[PDB]
């Protein structure tokens, strides 16, 4: 993202969350010094061979959305996750109109 | 230590004849030390280890070793001030108030002072080494 | 009140208050409450003298106690102790933030952590510290708390100055202003504020950084240093705000550092160093002093050799100043500042020590006369040194006076009026030897020098006074006889070279000088007329017993009002005056068989304080000297202790809801507990039984009065004032408590003490009774939830600090006060100054006085 | 001996004994700061160093720092002044500037834990060759500690083999040079290594329980010097630390009961005691009060130990020696707290009369406080102090801890006033005093230990 000088996946890789030491929606292991991005890369990678185009989209949407939530409903932690998580959501969203599916977009 | 022992139970003018200096360990004894009720302290008949010691001390002179050893020894000679004081107590031979003021000195009081490579010039001048 | 002294019908409530105010987050309240005899587990209880008389070790205790940080109560109390007496180094080394990862996200209203950490490293920090650690300490979720908003923007100002941005820095500092001014500040009815003093001193340091960033260049910034020295000249009395203010300045000069700003950083460290020293905190003081140690500071290591000349190494301190002074006569090394400072201190050292005969020390006096020629603190300190030498030669034999000392005093009185660097302050140092040689003159009416020497000093007195000897109290107790030809001459020649003299209304050994001064070319009216007028009035009405108009209602006299209303004073501030525009009159015609009273009426139209005394008290005046010494010491916390000044120039001469204080003290007396039978059990009856008697007093009752009066500012500031003048009371062993001990005004501030009319009166007094300060049986409850060991304890520690580096000079002063006419114990407790709490002390000392 | 009287031939050869001593052991503004450095009063020059090394840019003074605030064993401030648990790790792959690790790992290695030892153990390996010896010693025993964090005792003994090999090969020289006062670090480390991992006499589990009693005898072999020889329960605070598993992990801090009994330089005692208070051990809390008092304070620790003294009369209060030790500390705190006239101290004299018997060295503490008050109060022939002598001599019969030792404490003034009377005898008041004290010490001699 303009000014976010990085591979925003790496950006995410710079997001650890101590309080939440337990996380798992569609295989989303996260712990104390365990970066949001470490699990983001985890997903991205094996989710490529698992999911298809739009199911990849949807899986990111829903999983990283569970992240969106459980950090959002976790007022004790800070939410640096959700901005770039949502930025990821946008690269997802933008990636294609026709490929992206309205069910995923709905959700 | 025995010099502070004696001149804090207040004898004054320790006869050179009395001092015996064993070659085995280096003990320095007072044999009579008449000192009860400041015996001879008021009389003060005699009202009187140089660079050779410093040459033997080392290349840095006294720097370090002497007073580091002697100041762990200070930690020694202030923790048990009262025990070494009752060791002093053996200078009766016939006092108390002077003993008290100068054992306060032992604890750390300085003469006319409420106070309770340059260490070459400092610790060589340590009072516990150069007072008398 | 309506339950016993210590139990759970008193503890549970105290503990829930603890929890709630810890949530709030006031650090000094924290200290007081966590101390108050908490009887829990050893760690949580130990804070009994948490900072007073041992602080650093209990501080590292709290430190490794919160090392797991999983008792966040214990870790905000960590950072508590770190604040309360300044271990900001382990603040910046408290490894929750200064690590690979920092914050545990949203330190919640547990944010006492954040607030303290922030102020601490904002004063001892840098781009590394402030940058990365606001980068950890801002980022939180629940807006619930704002301490960290404040300090985060002060630190963002700092990072901006490091980013070289006048505009950005100004904006951030001004926003810090906004926040603290809005939600940190408190009201009036209360303006005994000193709690709020911490926050407004934060505001002051922010203003400092703001114009330090608008500072155009080195010349504008030199003006800036001058205006901050003027701050240092008229801001207040405490170590703690010196610390915050100039340490924040230090962060400034460090974050924004060029070559000129490296000299800046050096000088700020030197300032904070020597000030933090001079206010007995040779710990963090020493730390930042060594920070500037890395920067070519000979004088400064002489001040460190001085703190050890207090602690343990007189010999080596003296030696190093010897060789360093006589060896650093090379490049720079200003001779009348570097050389003269070091050898000056060498001279006072040897005056004090007398381990090396004063022979070479009179020779180093000659040596400063040589190397020093622009500077004069050597001159005044050698006036006092040769005062000691007139004493020594009076011990040598019948030669008290001296030509060298007389000439020293002579050029000092050639230099009096210029600035008054220590003149009014050291006035005791001169009156002592003047009256000692006056006593010599009356004695030996060998000692063939009192005549010429005494007359030379009297000519000194006359030459200064005539077109200006104002400091005469407990030696000119009363003027009733000649055989000196100077006493009355001066005590009544000040009365015309000082322009209260219109409202007065041996027996043959007094007149000659009186009519001599009548002879003198200035004679408005003959005062002894009215003096013996009222004398015969009294001695006729002294015996008219049963079983005022004669000299009263007359005024327009030539002598001063007999009633104690004369001399509220000024002090070194730089043209300096020994009293606003006023004309004493109205001779009291009340037959009080004696209160005659007026107040302040100046030109502007305000009202200034008043309090009535009598009968030759000056130990009061030395307490005003002590307050001015606190001022010059400062020259966070900042205890608000106001001060009047009852000086004199003859006999009997010189100066919360509080209406609630008055009536509640009335109800304590008027609970109808008999006011003269408790004294029967105290004195007239069993003493070892009077011990449990004073306990049944404390449990029969006062303190309700005190806290009902108090709320936060009232309690906190009265406690701070009581801390400071209570430690002064004990340190000066004065005691002898009074009957309306505290009576102040009701609007904005004024919180202080009264009595102080005594000096060693509790140990060196006919039938000594418990030498201490003014203490009550339920003094703990006088402070309430924090106890008399609380913020009292904290600002008591600040009192130790605020009066234990000028302490050698203060002891030298009190040596004079001894005055047994109306030594051993004197020097002994001088050395002592050098080196609950009614729940315990009451029974122990008070009863083992009356048990 | 053939030198000029002034030291002017010294310039070239005064920079050399201060480099040879740093191994041998016989140990301008910056040149005028270390005036007090170790002169019985460290704190000032010690934080002189921690300051001049906050600059963390001058290595000579940096080692000076660490070695100094090291000698009087401020070891967890040493691990505090760590350049590693910070913005970066420590001086990575530590080149010839590893001596700061050398000074610090032992700091952690006895004042540190699973978290501390580990976070440094994975920050010391660092180099690429194994060149260093001191920090490699402390590394071996740091990794022995993380080894019994994994809790495999035998291969912890393996890392102890590595450490022992290292010190015994690369850390000592022959006799004719160095009396062991300056092999202090070496032999202290040696004693600690055995206690870390050695299984023969304490190898069995039955042995282990009775070795709590047999660890009380570690001071016998080691010594009584506060430096490192004192091992009454100080080394026991390490036996149960090495043996820390569930119930034995709860006993780790419980074994530090009389550890701080030794503790001015107690910042270290402070950190360790905080760690233990994390278990609520009354003896440990008592010795926390001990350290705070020893700094110098009277009545802070007065109040806390006295409230605990009147508190734990049933709860916990190990019958063996818990309140007896709160009361030892209490009694000498009264002695140096100047507030506890005879009845006050005699209250807890009675307290021990009621609660405990196997330790009356407290009764001698009351004795020495009575000595203080009697001499400050009669500086003779005071029936108060003679009744004092009576109850003291009655207490001197049985518990035979220091009777012989500090019996002259009282008999010295008693016999000296006897001598003053027999020279000059108003003084006809030592009469009954000498008579009854002579008779009662006679019944003592008749009913007391012979020696």
CATH number at residue C688: 1.10.1070.11
CB count within 10 Å of CB B53 equals 13
Quick check: D173 and D186 in contact, CB under 8 A? no
Quick check: D359 and D399 in contact, CB under 8 A? yes
Tokens representing C504? 């007065």
Using CA atoms, how far apart are residues D414 and D408, in angstroms rounded to an integer? Answer: 9
Cross-strand pairs, D230: D223
Tokens representing C49? 């003298």
Q: How was this structure determined?
A: cryo-EM
Of B85, C321, C355, B116, which is closest to residue D40 (Cα–Cα)?
Answer: B116
Of D106, D40, D107, D35, which is closest to residue D267 (Cα–Cα)?
Answer: D107
CB count within 10 Å of CB A70 equals 18
Using CA atoms, how far apart are residues C301 and C306, in angstroms rounded to an integer? Answer: 8
Nearest by CB: A19 against C105, C139, C140: C105
- Contact list in B for residue D409 (CB cut-off 8 A) is 86
| Closest CA in chain B for residue C311 | B115
Measure in Å the smallest separation between the Cα of C316 and chain B Cα atoms: 6
Quick check: C87 and C287 in contact, CB under 8 A? no
Instruction: Give me the residues of D, 87-126, that contact C with CB < 8 A.
Output: 87-89
Using CA atoms, how far apart are residues C387 and C397, in angstroms rounded to an integer? Answer: 15
Tokens representing D172? 């000592």
Our CA angle for D89, D91, D92, nearest 5°, is 70
Q: Which residues of D323-352 are buried (b: 16+ CB within 10 A; e: fewer)?
A: bbbbbbbbbbbbbebebbbbeebbebbebb
CB count within 10 Å of CB D34 equals 17
Residue whose entry in the numeric block shows the structure tokens 């009396």 = D179
By the 10 Å C-beta count (0-12 exposed, 13-18 middle, 19+ buried), D139 is classed as: buried
| Closest CA in chain C for residue B131 | C355
Quick check: A9 and A37 in contact, CB under 8 A? yes
Quick check: D344 and D334 in contact, CB under 8 A? yes
Element (H, E) at D245: none
Tokens representing C438? 């006056």
Q: Do B61 and D18 touch (CB under 8 A)?
A: no
Positive or negative, the CA dihedral C808, C810, C813, C814 is negative
Q: Which residues of C738-769 are buried (b: 16+ CB within 10 A; e: fewer)?
A: eeeebebeeeebbbbbbbbbbbbbbbbbeeee
By the 10 Å C-beta count (0-12 exposed, 13-18 middle, 19+ buried), C647 is classed as: buried
Q: Which residues of C274-292 are buried (b: 16+ CB within 10 A; e: fewer)?
A: bbbbbbbbbbbbbbbbbbb
Tokens representing D97? 């500037």
Nearest by CB: C57 against D275, D286, D295: D295
Q: 3-class SS at A53? A: helix
- Contact list in C for residue B119 (CB cut-off 8 A) is 316
The upper half-sphere exposure of residue D349, i.e. CA atoms within 13 Å in the direction of its Cβ, equals 23
Evaluate whether chains C and B are touching (3 or more beta carbon pairs less than 8 Å apart): yes
- Contact list in B for residue C316 (CB cut-off 8 A) is 118-119, 121-122, 125
Using CA atoms, how far apart are residues C713 and C193, in angstroms rounded to an integer? Answer: 5
Alpha carbon C721 to its chain centroid, in Å, reads: 10
For chain B, counts of helices (H) and of strands (E): 7, 0
Chain A residues bordering chain C (beta-carbon distance below 8 Å): 16-19, 33, 75-80
Tokens representing D109? 């290695």
CB count within 10 Å of CB C387 equals 21
Does B118 touch chain C if contact means CB atoms closer than 8 Å? yes
Measure in Å the smallest separation between the Cα of B123 and chain C Cα atoms: 8
First to last CA, chain B: 12
Q: Do B122 and C309 touch (CB under 8 A)?
A: no
Q: What torsion, rounded to 10 degrees, do the Cα atoms D2, D3, D4, D10 define?
A: 170
Using CA atoms, how far apart are residues C136 and A18, in angstroms rounded to an integer? Answer: 14
Does D50 touch chain C if contact means CB atoms closer than 8 Å? yes
Element (H, E) at C170: helix C166-179
By the 10 Å C-beta count (0-12 exposed, 13-18 middle, 19+ buried), D390 is classed as: middle
Q: Distances from the Cα of D298 to the Cαs of D293, D295, D306, D335, in angstroms? A: 6, 10, 12, 9
Does B58 touch chain D if contact means CB atoms closer than 8 Å? yes
Q: Give C536-545's long-range contacts (Cβ < 8 A, gap of 24+).
A: C537/C505, C541/C593, C544/C593
Positive or negative, the CA dihedral C476, C482, C486, C489 is positive
Element (H, E) at C491: helix C487-491
Cross-strand pairs, D310: none
Q: What torsion, rounded to 10 degrees, do the Cα atoms C100, C104, C110, C111 define?
A: 50
Quick check: D196 and D220 in contact, CB under 8 A? no
This structure's resolution (Å) is 4.0
Tokens representing D237? 């605070």
- Contact list in B for residue C314 (CB cut-off 8 A) is 110, 113, 115
Of D94, D103, D165, which is closest to residue D135 (Cα–Cα)?
Answer: D103
Nearest by CB: B86 against D21, D35, D412: D412
Using CA atoms, how far apart are residues D212 and C831, in angstroms rounded to an integer? Answer: 48
Of C664, C669, C658, C663, which is closest to residue C717 (Cα–Cα)?
Answer: C658
Q: 3-class SS at C17? A: helix
Task: Indicate the angle between helix axes D383-395 and D342-355, nearest 10 degrees.
Answer: 20
Q: Which residues contact C179 (CB under 8 A, 6 or more apart)?
A: C146, C149, C150, C153
Mutate to test the interface with C, among D270, D283, D315, D341 (most CBs of C within 10 A): D270
Instruction: Give me the residues of B, 86-115, that contact C with CB < 8 A.
Output: 108, 110-115
Of B81, D41, B116, which is closest to residue C833 (Cα–Cα)?
Answer: B116
Quick check: D63 and D103 in contact, CB under 8 A? yes
Q: Which residues contact D334 (CB under 8 A, 6 or more apart)?
A: D302, D340, D344, D345, D369
Residue C392 zone, left/alpha/beta (φ > 0; ψ -120 to 50; rest): alpha
User: What is the interface size between B and D, counted as CB pairs within 8 Å?
Assistant: 57
- Contact list in B for residue D26 (CB cut-off 8 A) is 58, 64-65
Q: Distances from the Cα of A90 to the Cαs of A54, A83, A94, A100, C521, in angstroms? A: 14, 10, 6, 11, 102
Q: Which residues contact C406 (CB under 8 A, 6 or more apart)?
A: C453, C456, C457
Measure in Å the smallest separation between the Cα of B79 and chain C Cα atoms: 17
Residue whose entry in the numeric block shows the structure tokens 């950005």 = C168
Using CA atoms, how far apart are residues C482 and C489, in angstroms rounded to an integer? Answer: 9
Q: Which residues contact C611 (CB under 8 A, 6 or more apart)?
A: C644, C646, C655, C754
Q: Do D300 and C90 touch (CB under 8 A)?
A: no
- Contact list in D for residue C68 (CB cut-off 8 A) is 278
Using CA atoms, how far apart are residues C602 and A22, in angstroms rounded to an integer? Answer: 76
Quick check: C286 and D23 in contact, CB under 8 A? no
- Contact list in A for residue C140 (CB cut-off 8 A) is 78
Cross-strand pairs, B110: B113
Q: What is the DSSP letter of C374?
A: S
First to last CA, chain A: 24
Does B79 touch chain D if contact means CB atoms closer than 8 Å? no
Measure in Å the smallest separation between the Cα of A42 and chain C Cα atoms: 22
Mutate to test the interface with D, among C47, C57, C96 (most CBs of D within 10 A): C57
Quick check: D34 and D48 in contact, CB under 8 A? yes
Does C352 touch chain B if contact means CB atoms closer than 8 Å? yes
| Closest CA in chain C for residue A18 | C104
Residue whose entry in the numeric block shows the structure tokens 């340490």 = C247
Of D107, D73, D74, which is closest to residue D90 (Cα–Cα)?
Answer: D107
Tokens representing A82? 């959700």
Q: What is the DSSP letter of C49?
A: G
Tokens representing D122? 């994975």
> What is the greatest pairwise CA distance in chain B?
48
Alpha carbon C209 to its chain centroid, in Å, reads: 28
Q: What are phi and psi of C818, to 5 degrees?
A: -40, -65
Q: Do A77 and C105 touch (CB under 8 A)?
A: yes
Q: Do B64 and D13 touch (CB under 8 A)?
A: no
- Contact list in C for residue D35 (CB cut-off 8 A) is 305, 308, 313, 316-317, 320
Using CA atoms, how far apart are residues C819 and C822, in angstroms rounded to an integer? Answer: 7
For chain A, counts of helices (H) and of strands (E): 5, 0
CB count within 10 Å of CB C620 equals 22
Measure in Å the smallest separation between the Cα of B127 and chain C Cα atoms: 9
- Contact list in C for residue B112 (CB cut-off 8 A) is 352-355
| DSSP line for C257-296 | --SHHHHHHHHHHHHHHHHHHHTT-TTHHHHHHHHHHTT-
Tokens representing C184? 């940190």
Using CA atoms, how far apart are residues D83 and D261, in angstroms rounded to an integer? Answer: 32
Q: Do D39 and B71 touch (CB under 8 A)?
A: yes
Q: Do C290 and D288 touch (CB under 8 A)?
A: no
Measure in Å the smallest separation between the Cα of C810 and chain B Cα atoms: 14
Q: Do C316 and B118 touch (CB under 8 A)?
A: yes
Using CA atoms, how far apart are residues C558 and C27, in angstroms rounded to an integer? Answer: 57
Partners for D (CB, 8 Å, 3+ pairs)?
A: B, C
Q: What is the DSSP letter of D223?
A: B
Element (H, E) at C391: helix C377-396
Residue whose entry in the numeric block shows the structure tokens 């000079």 = C809
Evaluate whether chains A and D are touching (3 or more beta carbon pairs less than 8 Å apart): no
The upper half-sphere exposure of residue A87, i.e. CA atoms within 13 Å in the direction of its Cβ, equals 17
Residue whose entry in the numeric block shows the structure tokens 């003896």 = D283
Q: Do D271 and C48 touch (CB under 8 A)?
A: no
Q: 3-class SS at B21? A: strand
Using CA atoms, how far apart are residues C311 and C32, in angstroms rounded to an integer? Answer: 30
Measure in Å the smallest separation between the Cα of A19 and chain C Cα atoms: 8
Positive or negative, the CA dihedral D202, D204, D207, D211 is positive
Quick check: C612 and C214 in contact, CB under 8 A? no
Using CA atoms, how far apart are residues D206 and C246, in angstroms rounded to an integer? Answer: 64
Instruction: Give me the residues of D, 302-321, that contact C with CB < 8 A.
Output: 302-304, 307-308, 311
Using CA atoms, how far apart are residues D322 and D324, in angstroms rounded to an integer? Answer: 5
Mutate to test the interface with D, among C8, C37, C46, C97 (most CBs of D within 10 A): C46
Of C118, C34, C120, C129, which is closest to residue C85 (Cα–Cα)?
Answer: C120
Using CA atoms, how far apart are residues C82 and C113, in angstroms rounded to an integer? Answer: 10
Q: Do D289 and C311 touch (CB under 8 A)?
A: no
Domain range for C778 is 658-851
């Amino acid at each position: 993202i303009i000014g976010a000088d990085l591979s925003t996946i790496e950006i995410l890789n710079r997001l650890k969350l101590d309080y939440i030491t337990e996380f798992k929606f569609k295989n989303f292991v996260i712990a104390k010094g365990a970066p949001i991005g470490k699990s983001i890369v985890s997903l991205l990678l094996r989710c490529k061979k698992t999911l298809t185009l739009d199911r990849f989209i949807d899986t990111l949407l829903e999983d990283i959305a569970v992240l969106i939530k459980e950090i959002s409903v976790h007022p004790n932690e800070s939410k640096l996750a959700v901005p770039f998580l949502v930025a990821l959501m946008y690269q997802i969203v933008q990636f294609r109109p026709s490929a992206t599916h309205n069910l995923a977009l709905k959700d | 230590v025995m010099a502070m022992v004696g001149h804090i139970l207040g004898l004054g003018d320790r006869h050179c004849e009395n001092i015996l200096l064993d070659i085995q360990t280096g003990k320095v004894l007072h044999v009579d030390f008449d000192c009860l009720f400041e015996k001879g302290k008021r009389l003060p008949v005699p009202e009187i280890l140089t660079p050779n010691l410093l040459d033997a001390l080392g290349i840095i002179g006294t720097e370090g070793t002497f007073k580091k050893s002697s100041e762990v020894t200070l930690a020694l000679m202030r923790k048990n001030e009262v025990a070494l004081m009752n060791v002093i107590e053996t200078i009766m031979y016939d006092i108390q108030k002077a003993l008290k003021v100068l054992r306060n000195k032992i604890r750390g009081i300085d003469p006319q002072d409420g106070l309770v490579t340059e260490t070459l010039i400092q610790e060589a001048t340590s009072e516990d080494n150069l007072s008398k | 009140r309506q339950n016993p002294h210590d139990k759970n019908q008193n503890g549970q409530l105290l503990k829930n208050l603890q929890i709630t105010y810890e949530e709030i987050g006031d650090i000094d309240s924290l200290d007081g409450v966590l101390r108050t005899f908490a009887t829990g587990n050893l760690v949580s209880k130990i804070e009994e003298l948490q900072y007073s008389e041992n602080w650093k070790l209990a501080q590292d205790c709290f430190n490794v106690l919160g090392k797991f940080s999983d008792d966040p109560k214990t870790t905000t109390r960590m950072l508590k102790s770190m604040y309360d007496h300044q271990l900001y180094s382990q603040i910046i080394s408290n490894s929750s933030f200064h690590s690979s990862d920092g914050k545990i996200s949203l330190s919640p209203d547990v944010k006492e952590w954040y607030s303290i950490g922030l102020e601490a490293a904002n004063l001892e920090g840098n781009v590394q510290t402030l940058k990365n650690w606001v980068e950890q300490i801002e980022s939180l979720r629940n807006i619930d708390d704002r301490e960290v908003l404040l300090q985060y923007n002060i630190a963002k100002a700092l990072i901006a100055i490091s980013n070289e941005d006048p505009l950005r820095t100004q904006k951030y500092i001004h926003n810090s202003f906004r926040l603290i001014g809005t939600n940190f500040i408190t009201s009036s009815k209360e303006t005994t504020l000193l709690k709020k003093q911490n926050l407004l001193m934060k505001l002051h340091s922010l203003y400092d950084l703001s114009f330090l960033s608008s500072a155009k260049d080195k010349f504008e910034y030199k003006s800036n240093t001058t205006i901050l020295d003027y701050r240092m000249e008229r801001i207040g009395a405490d170590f703690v705000p010196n610390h915050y203010i100039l340490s924040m300045r230090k962060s400034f000069d460090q974050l924004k550092m060029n070559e000129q700003a490296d000299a800046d950083l050096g000088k700020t460290f030197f300032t904070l160093a020597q000030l933090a020293r001079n206010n007995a905190r040779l710990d963090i003081a020493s730390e930042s002093l060594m920070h500037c140690l890395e920067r070519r500071l000979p004088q400064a290591e002489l001040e460190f050799a001085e703190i050890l000349w207090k602690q343990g190494e007189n010999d080596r301190a003296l030696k190093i100043v010897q060789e360093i002074h006589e060896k650093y006569q090379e490049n720079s090394s200003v001779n009348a500042r570097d050389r003269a400072a070091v050898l000056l201190k060498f001279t006072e050292w040897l005056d004090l020590s007398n381990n090396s005969a004063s022979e070479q020390i009179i020779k180093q006096y000659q040596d400063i006369f040589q190397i020093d020629s622009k500077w004069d603190k050597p001159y005044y300190s050698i006036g006092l040194y040769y005062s000691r030498l007139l004493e020594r030669k009076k011990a040598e034999g019948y030669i008290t006076n001296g030509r060298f000392e007389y000439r020293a005093i002579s050029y000092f009185l050639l230099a009096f009026e210029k600035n008054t660097a220590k003149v009014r302050e050291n006035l005791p140092k001169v009156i002592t030897f003047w009256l000692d040689i006056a006593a010599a003159s009356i004695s030996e009416a060998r000692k063939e020098m009192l005549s010429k020497a005494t007359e030379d000093i009297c000519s000194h007195v006359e030459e200064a006074l005539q077109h200006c000897w104002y400091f005469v109290l407990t030696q000119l107790l009363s003027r009733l006889l000649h055989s000196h030809q100077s006493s009355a001459q001066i005590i009544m020649h000040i009365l015309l070279s000082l322009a209260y003299i219109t409202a007065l209304v041996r027996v043959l050994r007094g007149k000659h000088i009186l009519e001599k001064y009548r002879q003198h070319s200035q004679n408005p009216h003959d005062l002894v007329s009215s003096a013996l007028d009222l004398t015969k009035a009294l001695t006729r009405v002294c015996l008219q017993d049963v079983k005022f108009k004669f000299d009263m209602n007359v005024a327009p006299s030539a002598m001063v009002v007999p009633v104690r209303k004369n001399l509220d004073i000024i002090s070194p501030l730089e043209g300096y005056q020994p009293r606003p525009v006023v004309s004493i009159i109205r001779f009291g015609s009340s037959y009080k068989v004696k209160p005659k009273q007026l107040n302040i009426i100046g030109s502007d139209g305000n009202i200034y304080g008043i309090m009535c005394k009598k009968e030759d008290v000056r130990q009061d005046n030395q307490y005003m000297q002590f307050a001015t010494t606190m001022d010059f010491l400062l020259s966070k916390r900042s205890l608000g202790i106001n001060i009047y000044s009852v000086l004199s120039l003859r006999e009997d001469c010189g100066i919360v809801t509080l209406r609630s204080i008055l009536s509640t003290k009335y109800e304590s007396l008027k609970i109808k507990y008999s006011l003269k039978s408790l004294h029967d059990r105290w004195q007239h009856t069993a003493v070892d039984g009077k011990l449990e008697f004073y306990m049944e007093q404390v449990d029969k009752f006062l303190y309700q009065w005190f806290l009902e009066n108090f709320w936060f500012n009232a309690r906190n500031t009265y406690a701070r004032s009581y801390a400071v003048m209570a430690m002064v009371g004990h340190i000066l062993g004065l005691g002898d408590r009074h009957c309306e001990n505290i009576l102040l005004d009701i609007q904005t501030g004024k919180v202080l003490h009264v009595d102080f009319d005594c000096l060693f009166k509790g140990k060196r007094l006919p039938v000594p009774e418990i030498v201490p300060f003014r203490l009550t049986p339920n003094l703990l409850d006088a402070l309430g939830i924090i106890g008399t060991e609380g913020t009292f304890k904290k600002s008591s520690e600040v009192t130790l600090a605020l009066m234990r580096k000028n302490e050698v000079a203060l002891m030298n002063v009190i040596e004079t006060i001894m005055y047994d006419r109306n030594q051993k114990a004197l020097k002994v407790l001088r050395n002592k100054i050098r080196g609950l709490s009614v729940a315990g002390q009451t029974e122990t000392l008070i009863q083992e006085a009356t048990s | 001996r053939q030198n000029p009287h002034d030291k002017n031939q010294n310039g070239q050869l005064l920079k050399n004994l201060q480099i040879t001593y740093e191994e041998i052991g016989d140990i301008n503004l910056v040149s005028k700061i270390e005036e007090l450095q170790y002169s019985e009063n460290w704190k000032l020059a010690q934080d002189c160093f921690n300051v001049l090394g906050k600059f963390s840019d001058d290595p000579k003074t940096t080692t000076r720092m660490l070695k100094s605030m090291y000698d009087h064993q401020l070891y967890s401030q040493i691990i505090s002044n760590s350049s590693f648990h910070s913005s970066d790790g420590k001086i990575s792959l530590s080149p010839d500037v590893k001596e700061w690790y050398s000074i610090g790992l032992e700091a952690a290695n006895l004042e540190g834990n699973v978290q501390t030892l580990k976070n440094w153990v994975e920050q010391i390996e660092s180099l690429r060759n194994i060149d260093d010896r001191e920090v490699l010693l402390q590394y071996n025993i740091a990794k022995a500690l993380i080894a019994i964090s994994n809790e495999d005792p035998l291969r912890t003994q393996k890392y102890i083999h590595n450490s022992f090999r290292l010190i015994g090969t690369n850390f000592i020289t022959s006799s004719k040079e160095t009396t062991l006062l300056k092999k202090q670090n070496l032999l202290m480390k040696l004693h600690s290594l055995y206690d870390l991992s050695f299984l023969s006499s304490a190898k069995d589990k039955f042995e282990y329980k009775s070795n709590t009693t047999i660890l009380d005898y570690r001071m016998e072999r080691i010594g009584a010097d506060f430096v490192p020889n004192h091992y009454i329960l100080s080394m026991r605070k390490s036996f149960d630390q090495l043996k820390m598993n569930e119930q034995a992990d709860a006993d780790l801090g419980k074994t530090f009961f009389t550890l701080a009994q030794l503790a001015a330089r107690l910042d270290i005692a402070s950190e360790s005691l905080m760690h233990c208070l994390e278990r609520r051990l009354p003896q440990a809390e008592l010795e926390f009060a001990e350290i705070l008092w020893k700094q110098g304070e009277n009545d802070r620790a007065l109040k806390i130990v006295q409230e605990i003294h009147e508190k734990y009369q049933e709860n916990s209060s190990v019958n063996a020696r818990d309140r007896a030790a709160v009361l030892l500390k209490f009694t000498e705190w009264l002695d140096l707290s100047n507030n506890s006239a005879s009845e006050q101290i005699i209250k807890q004299y009675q307290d021990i009369f009621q609660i405990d018997s196997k330790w009356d060295k407290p009764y001698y503490s009351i004795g020495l406080y009575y000595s203080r008050l009697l001499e400050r109060k009669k500086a003779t022939n005071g029936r108060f102090e003679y009744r004092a002598i009576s109850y003291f001599l009655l207490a001197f019969e049985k518990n035979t801890a220091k009777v012989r030792e500090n019996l002259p404490k009282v008999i010295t003034f008693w016999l000296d006033i006897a001598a003053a009377s027999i020279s000059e005898a108003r003084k006809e008041m030592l009469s009954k005093a000498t008579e009854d004290i002579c008779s009662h010490v006679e019944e003592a001699l008749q009913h007391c230990p012979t020696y």
